[PDB]
Design a protein around this ligand. Structure first.
Ligand SMILES: Nc1nc(Nc2ccc(S(N)(=O)=O)cc2)sc1C(=O)c1ccc2ccccc2c1
Length: 278
């Protein structure tokens, strides 16, 4: 736009490009997402403006002009992917990992109680600041990374539930802990099969109805579930217990964000400050 001064491109989603920009009039620094072009999502979007929570990136303005849709967000200084990469040699301290997971669960508990789903959580849209907060960014409306996709989506479910976000966050939690992506698939079927090889091929016993799903094939290989202690070695039993509940195959058995916040893993949660290199 003319009201903004593009400082630099900082990302790109499936819907548009995000820039760090300065309001030529207020001097305010913001994140500006440009979507190159409906009359339905507009409400859905305009509604996201109401959402106000410490762990949700604030949507400041929505501007529809010249076949373009611009979303103005408060600017955060770094995303979790960059932070994880910067922390690869030493690893993120467990207390900070726990604080981040706890805050993200609060954010999800909030959006889910307002019937809002994210649908595409990943390290690149989890933003952090110098004060130790972490926030959910770039909510998805009703090379693409499939690493955090819930199995029901991969199997063709038509209606997503809040459980898809818990799964994605569980995958991110594991990655912060091990410094290795949990399920790094490079195709939908490779993604699905990597999940199967680790958690075991699901069946009607652990996931009632799974064999009736759109993309389920009786021909799927039958892998046995791997020992969970081999999945996230550096994580204590409270952490492993919580992770296993976030990664249940059955959407209805998968733990809710609200219930997760009450898990024993968070008994000693604190809010450490990260060492950020900006
Ligand atoms: N609010 C906000 N702040 C940001 N700053 C930032 C500062 C430094 C870095 S970085 N690679 O650490 O130097 C990264 C982001 S982005 C962002 C978003 O609201 C946003 C919008 C669309 C997206 C579309 C796709 C993915 C993320 C997205 C995030």
């Amino acid at each position: 736009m003319e009201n903004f001064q593009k400082v630099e491109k900082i990302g790109e989603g499936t819907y548009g490009v995000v820039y760090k920009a300065r309001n030529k009039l207020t001097g305010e620094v913001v994140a500006l997402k440009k979507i190159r072009l409906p009359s339905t999502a507009i409400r859905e979007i305009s509604l996201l403006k109401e959402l106000n929570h410490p762990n949700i990136v604030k949507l400041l303005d929505v501007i529809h002009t010249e076949n373009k849709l611009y979303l103005v967000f408060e600017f955060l200084h770094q995303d979790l992917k960059k932070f994880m990469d910067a922390s690869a040699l030493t690893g993120i301290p467990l207390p900070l990992i726990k604080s981040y997971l706890f805050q993200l669960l609060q954010g999800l508990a909030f959006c889910h109680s307002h019937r809002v789903l994210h649908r595409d959580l990943k390290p690149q849209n989890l933003l952090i600041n110098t004060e130790g907060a972490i926030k959910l960014a770039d909510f998805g409306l009703a090379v693409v990374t499939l690493w955090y996709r819930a199995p029901e989506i991969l199997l063709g479910c038509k209606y997503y539930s809040t459980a898809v976000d818990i799964w994605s966050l569980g995958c991110i939690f594991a990655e912060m802990v091990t410094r290795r992506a949990l399920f790094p698939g490079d195709s939908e079927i490779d993604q699905l099969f990597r999940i199967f090889r680790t958690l075991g091929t699901p069946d009607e016993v652990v996931w009632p109805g799974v064999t009736s799903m759109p993309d389920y094939k009786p021909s799927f290989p039958k892998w046995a579930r791997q020992d969970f202690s081999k999945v996230v070695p550096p994580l204590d039993e409270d952490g492993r217990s919580l992770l296993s509940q976030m990664l249940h195959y059955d959407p209805n058995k998968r733990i809710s964000a609200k219930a997760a916040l009450a898990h024993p893993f968070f008994q000693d949660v604190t809010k450490p400050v990260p060492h950020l290199r900006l």
